[PDB]
């Protein structure tokens, strides 16, 4: 019989049962997206998107609904900060229920196309064989793709008939869903400019409509049909797998590097926003803009938003968890209750010491307090006997500005050293390690997990592209090579050209 | 040595599938090479057997029946399909190197199997529970602090002579 | 425990810079290469005996006298792949090479461990490239040396009472 890995190859010469197996895959995918969002609703704590947003709770598909306008629940909560809203039908519940209702409907359609495989539409009229016109099928689907690319860009994304998309300020503080106008100049190829994401879909939708119309009315060349074996549908498989791994490589990058499509209020900070100290520079940019107004440090730091200082914390870096450190980010550090404040470290000299922040490579990192002139002035020592720069020796005190501990100064070096090992993580936050048994072991965000799946899928789909392109170009030979393969066929210099029997 | 200290890449299960695939490949290279070479049919009257093979011949140059009976009693199991044997030789290093790829893609995002959370919970409130796992993690703290001010010069790691993790007398 | 043994060994004996371990990696990377090479050139060259509706493995029946793959096609394939004379068109000379490359590889690698038993360590290029003034220009082997220092000052943190790690 068939090998176990070849069991689905009963659908190549069965296009009606190929449609049914596809309808069932699409039913399971739409069923998962409904099932995942309903499970995500059952575990989402929505009452604090400042210090416990969706990317802290491991909300996988809650940001993908959010980034295209779905903002409220029938429960009453909106993710943007309000409660009591009626967002109509398209809630996180109604979207998820629409995906389950779709999945039952694609199920019964798959049940219909499985029993009624033997439609004359698949049968070729000139030879009675079940045949798919894959060039004409492609232009039909390319026309439909560009119709749904244009209309998503020019109605949904523009907001003219549609919600828009998730827009942000660069530091992700007051990000919401707005209509976005298309960017038609060169700034539309900036991936962080959302006007290009709208203007892509308008423009690529038209070009896909134009090309969809092309591949309907223009037939393939006789030499392009035969190079690709366009009669076979394994070539549609090998070039579509080629597309989806390119596309999964792109979404792995634009999730990891960040784009306008992947905002930080929904998927979290990127790892490169911690590498650059991109929020630390902004936090100090605001503080010095009040240190020149005359506003003192306790004042000039109690105006930093708690959401902004939460982005400047290494437990929100997606390059900080681990492959089996499972679950939400709140399973790691915890649920952030409040900002403890900006720890300013001063020695017994009263001169300000700056903690060497930890890079995302490091599991452990020594606590080392440099000054503005770079020279190391204090550290928590490993070997403490021959030490010179301990917190006890150099008299290091810690003062907090803003946050919970606004106007508190700790001078006793055990309490200074505890806050110093948390100041290598950035801004120090008070975590609830009691809601969900948070063991301190750092976790990954939905930004980091999505990149892992979709760059490991894209690599696994690189092999699938290779395998199915091998199956296409070598279709005569996957039972084996010819028994009547001549020894003079692969012998050198029996033919002037490799492969051709007329060049002897 | 970077990936041991920073990623604990030995402990990653995707690297172990690569070690099982590479060393399985090198084993299946050595085993199948020596099995064929020691089950050869005597086709030439000389004591050096390599000239007992012309390539246009259609005989098996070695005794796959003897080779199957050798390994069935030595090791317990033997290939009996020469096509499945040579697919398994294709399969084993290629699946191993593909599994190591999946781990390194995870390590691109620093998704390590760095720690078994259940053991460092055990070892952080028990100072007598030592395994070879926590010894390797002590070695990785050695790598990550001794190598990094030299390995990563852009970071301007100025690690003093006292923050360095050091055992006794070394 | 194996990974403990590997880390400590590199810390004390610099096994990566030992050429006998490098011939061993040349024995197992080559061994895995020539496994996947020989595994894929034989699988590439199987004569059609079966249909695409069942497995090509059933083209072999055990004990058959015909060779199940065309050795001339695989040599014709692999000979055109690199150049004709890089290619074992002799099946016996082929399987000696498959036998001998990982075996002599792992022989030398076991001779790596057996010679670093008696502390004949790997190549020690610590502070080898120095400038005109005499300042040490660090190399890649000086970055390994700092990693080697990292494991060796931390392996058996309490066992050493003395500054030199002799054995």
């Amino acid at each position: 019989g068939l090998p176990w890995y070849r069991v689905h190859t009963v659908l190549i010469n069965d296009p009606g049962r190929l449609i049914a197996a596809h309808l069932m895959h699409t039913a399971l995918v739409a069923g998962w997206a409904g099932s995942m969002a309903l499970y995500e609703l059952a575990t989402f704590d929505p009452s604090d998107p400042v210090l416990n947003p969706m990317w802290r709770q491991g909300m996988f598909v809650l940001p993908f609904m959010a980034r295209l306008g779905v903002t409220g629940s029938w429960s009453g909560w909106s993710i943007t900060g309000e409660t009591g809203i009626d967002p109509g039908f398209w809630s996180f519940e109604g979207v998820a229920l629409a995906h389950i209702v779709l999945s039952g409907l694609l199920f019964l359609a798959a049940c219909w196309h499985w029993v009624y495989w033997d439609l004359e539409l698949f049968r070729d009229p000139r030879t009675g064989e079940p045949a798919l016109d894959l060039p004409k099928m492609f232009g039909i689907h390319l026309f439909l793709a560009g119709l749904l690319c244009f209309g998503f860009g020019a109605f949904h994304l523009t907001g003219l008939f549609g919600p828009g998309m998730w827009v942000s300020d660069p530091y992700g503080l007051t990000g919401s869903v707005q209509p976005v106008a298309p960017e038609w100049g060169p700034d539309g190829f900036n991936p962080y400019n959302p006007g290009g994401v709208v203007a892509h879909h308008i423009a690529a939708g038209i070009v896909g409509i134009i090309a969809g119309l092309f591949h309907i009315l223009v037939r393939p060349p006789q030499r392009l049909y035969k190079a690709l074996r366009m009669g076979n549908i394994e070539t549609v498989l090998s070039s579509s797998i080629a597309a989806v791994f390119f596309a999964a490589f792109v979404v792995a990058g634009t999730m990891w590097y960040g784009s306008a499509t992947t905002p930080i209020e929904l998927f979290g900070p990127t790892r490169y926003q911690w590498d650059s100290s991109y929020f630390q520079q902004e936090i100090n940019r605001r503080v010095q803009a009040s240190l020149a107004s005359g506003a003192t440090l306790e004042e000039a730091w109690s105006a930093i938003p708690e959401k902004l200082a939460f982005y400047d914390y290494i437990g929100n870096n997606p390059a900080k968890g681990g492959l089996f450190r499972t679950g939400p980010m709140n399973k790691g550090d915890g649920i952030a209750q409040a900002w403890k404040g900006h720890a300013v470290f001063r020695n017994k000299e009263g001169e300000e010491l700056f903690v060497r922040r930890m890079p995302a490579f490091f599991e452990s990192f020594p606590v080392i307090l440099t000054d503005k002139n770079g020279v190391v002035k204090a550290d928590i020592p490993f070997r403490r006997a021959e030490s010179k720069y301990s917190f006890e020796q150099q008299g290091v005190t810690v003062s907090f500005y803003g946050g919970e501990l606004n106007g508190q100064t700790f001078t006793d070096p055990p309490t200074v050293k505890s806050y110093a090992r948390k100041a290598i993580f950035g801004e120090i936050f008070e975590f609830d390690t009691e809601t969900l048994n948070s063991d301190g072991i750092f976790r990954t965000s939905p930004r980091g997990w999505f990149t892992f799946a979709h760059a490991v899928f894209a690599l696994l789909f690189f092999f699938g592209h290779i395998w199915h392109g091998a199956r296409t170009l070598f279709r005569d030979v996957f039972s084996g090579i010819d028994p009547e393969l001549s020894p003079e066929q692969v012998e050198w210099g029996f033919y002037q050209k490799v492969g051709d029997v007329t060049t002897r | 040595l970077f990936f041991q200290g920073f990623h604990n890449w030995t402990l990653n299960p995707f690297h172990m599938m690569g070690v099982a695939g590479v060393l399985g490949g090198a084993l299946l290279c050595a085993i199948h090479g020596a099995t064929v070479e020691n089950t050869l049919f005597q086709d030439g009257e000389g004591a050096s057997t390599f000239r007992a093979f012309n390539p246009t011949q259609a005989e098996e140059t070695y005794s796959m029946v003897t080779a199957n009976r050798f390994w069935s009693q030595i090791f317990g199991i033997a290939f009996s399909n020469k096509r499945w044997l040579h697919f398994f030789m294709l399969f084993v290093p290629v699946t191993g190197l593909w599994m190591s790829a999946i781990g390194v893609v995870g390590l691109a995002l620093n998704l390590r199997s760095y720690d078994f959370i259940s053991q460092e919970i055990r070892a952080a409130e028990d100072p007598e529970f030592e395994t070879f796992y926590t010894k390797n993690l002590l070695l990785n703290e050695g790598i990550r602090a001794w190598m990094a001010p030299q390995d990563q010069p852009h970071e301007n790691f100025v690690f003093p002579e006292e923050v360095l993790p050091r055992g006794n007398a070394l | 425990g194996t990974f403990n043994f590997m880390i400590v060994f590199q810390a004390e004996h610099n096994i990566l810079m030992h050429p006998f371990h490098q011939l061993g990696v040349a024995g197992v990377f080559g061994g895995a290469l020539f496994c996947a090479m020989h595994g894929s050139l034989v699988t590439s060259s199987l004569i059609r005996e079966t249909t695409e509706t069942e497995s090509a493995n059933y083209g072999y029946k055990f004990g058959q006298e015909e060779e199940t793959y065309n050795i001339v096609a695989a040599h014709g394939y692999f000979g055109r792949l690199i150049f004709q004379y890089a290619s074992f068109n002799n099946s016996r000379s082929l399987h000696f090479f498959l036998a001998a490359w990982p075996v002599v590889g792992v022989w030398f690698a076991a001779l790596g461990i057996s010679t670093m038993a008696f502390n004949l360590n790997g190549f020690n290029f610590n502070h080898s490239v120095i400038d005109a003034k005499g300042n040490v220009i660090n190399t890649w082997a000086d970055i390994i040396n700092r990693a080697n220092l990292g494991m060796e000052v931390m392996h058996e943190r309490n066992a050493h009472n003395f500054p030199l790690d002799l054995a």
């Binding site: 019989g1 068939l2 090998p3 176990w4 069991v7 009963v10 492959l323 089996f324 450190r325 499972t326 | 299960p13 172990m16 599938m17 199997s113 078994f116 959370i117 259940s118 | 509706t53 069942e54 497995s55």
Partner: peptide
């Protein structure tokens, strides 16, 4: 079309799974 799975493929495919789960159980318990 019938599926054929000979006993060696039950034996290797169970070997493939059990040594996969002997590997990954240390990480699934974590």
């Amino acid at each position: 079309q019938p599926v054929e799975l000979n006993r060696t493929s039950l034996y290797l495919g169970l070997l493939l799974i059990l040594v996969l789960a002997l590997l990954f159980s240390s990480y699934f318990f974590n």
